[PDB]
Amino acid sequence: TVWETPIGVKYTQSSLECAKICDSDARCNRAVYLTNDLPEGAFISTCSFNETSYRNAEYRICPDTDYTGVNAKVVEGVTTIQACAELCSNTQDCRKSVFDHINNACAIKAAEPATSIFWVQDKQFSTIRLPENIDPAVKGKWGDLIRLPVIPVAAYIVPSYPEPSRLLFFSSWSNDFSASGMTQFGDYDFATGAISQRTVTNTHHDMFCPGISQLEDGRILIQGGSDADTVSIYDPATNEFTRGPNMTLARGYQTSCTLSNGKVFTIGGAWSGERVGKNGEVYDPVANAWTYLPGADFRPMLTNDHEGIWREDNHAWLFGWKNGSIFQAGPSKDQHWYGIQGNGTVAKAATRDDDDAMCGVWVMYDAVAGKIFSAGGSPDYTDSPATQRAHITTIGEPNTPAEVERVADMGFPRGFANAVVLPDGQVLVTGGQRMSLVFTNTDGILVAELFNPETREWKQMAPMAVPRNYHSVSILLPDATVFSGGGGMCWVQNVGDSTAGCDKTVDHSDGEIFEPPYLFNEDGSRAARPVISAISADPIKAGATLTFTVEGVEGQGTAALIRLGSVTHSVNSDQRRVPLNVTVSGNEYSATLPDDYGILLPGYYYLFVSTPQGTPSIAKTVHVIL
Ligand SMILES: *[C@@H]1O[C@H](CO)[C@@H](O)[C@H](O)[C@H]1NC(C)=O
Ligand SMILES: [Cu+2]
């Protein structure tokens, strides 16, 4: 039984008497004789309670909320929201101010985006702001926080027909780690809003800190981690997990990559198992067998880290390429070619930079042209300032030099950011912080950045609401929007220990979705999406001609395949864009897939038809076979 204030607050002489008394007092959580939807402390994207205007220039007040961050001013005078508003009006460049109900003080928040300001639920304060004017045609648009049972520390799209509908995500034995043998998964149907959780135990696998690759049949191979030698295989068909063969060498914080021939290569992962650099290894799904590749030498790919070998072989930028080759774009200052021939091979490809970029963002935005875009990262895993440097790396024949062009610096240094490639081939960078500090919100960049390789120029997007630092994720949805989620997780010694001394402020058991500009016309209305009306649900093979019916476009539409995504620790080794050429005869479109499985990696892809102005369809799922 729960009374709900005129504003929207909810509690659990009288009883509505003290309850009324409690909602007078900014210092009252309990009373003897408060239970809102989101608890005190919770981050917000919108006022949870009823807003209020206040006046020749107007402000919107959200009660029972704080703006965390560097203040430009804190003044002990003010005793009314009115007066705090009045003071924000007389302070140059004040967009955000905070009234402290308990101490009668007005804070003016400092300037954005140089400062990072966060909107928290706290009954002790109220927030005052100057109405924002975001043109979604230029800056895209964020929806509101979607709350989740598990922090999405790792996440992947489930391959389904006609288009994927579900996002699986997962943490450790707990939803907010410690060899446990359990893994808490969340399940999010974004067709419906449906959100379930489960606990995966059959595999005897805590899948925290793993390699993730999508196989030919769209099964998801989840490798090592808290259980350093254990391997689980997720079958979309079953919606079940199966044990795979133990890896040959136990690993965590490694990258795996699906190859042209549908085997999976992994190298490094010194976080768990022995604390030593880790040589390469290849999984063959047909033989269902791991093979150790000693000549896949780890030494050439090490970073130099103040914390040592524990870190230096972590989170490798691996792309599966032509004739079963592996390109390693970083994060080591030097790029290399790795292979699975003999006892495995290694050779220098190029120098990307003068310093390492651990957990920088990387994506193959243009497979047919061998084009890779890198930005951000930091020279050491933690306690190191992030770089603004970004590069286009061009790869041709395996085991011959690569070309690196430095491009425009990002507007912000980002450590632990995420990147997705979009159907137009632009790369959207999200989250990360100015100084890589594991388990912190400190100086989280909220402003997303769109990089356009056509112009080799950056564009600052609308801000998201929650800092997406360490243990955050970015993945592409079938509607060509971007999910940004997670952040946090606590070190807990034993397994089953109760999180009471952990900092819950750094946990964000939630996500938020960004509409890029391309979903909007000049007037900020949603633009008219092509419809792929008809498509064979049939497997297709490299070199084949894909045929589909596109209704709802003014002019000749373009098309592109985006491989489905897997993501954790700023590593998405499964995403890649294959641009297609379209020949239009009627409303029936046809494209000849590339001849090379090094470009068209076996697996499930999004097909997108886009308007000539660059507005993409919802995707139809497309399965490439070997
Ligand atoms: C598409 O067509 C152009 C001209 O033939 C070509 O340069 C491009 O690389 C082709 N293949 C693609 C884009 O898959
Ligand atoms: Cu971690």
TrEMBL record:
Quote the protein name from its UniProt record: Kelch domain-containing protein
Query: Which residue intervals define the domain Apple in the entry?
Result: 59-115
Query: What species was this sequence derived from?
Result: Colletotrichum graminicola (strain M1.001 / M2 / FGSC 10212) (Maize anthracnose fungus)
Q: Which residues are glycosylated?
A: N246, N581
For this UniProt record, the keywords arranged alphabetically read as follows: Metal-binding, Signal
Q: Name the source's superkingdom.
A: Eukaryota
Spell out the CDD domains in the cross-references: E_set_GO_C (cd02851)
Q: Disulfide pairs? A: C22-C28, C47-C62, C84-C106, C88-C94, C490-C502
- Annotated ranges, domain Galactose oxidase-like Early set: 529-624
Q: Which residues bind Cu(2+)?
A: Y253, Y470, H471, H569
What's a Gene Ontology MF term here?
metal ion binding
Q: Does the keyword Signal apply?
A: yes
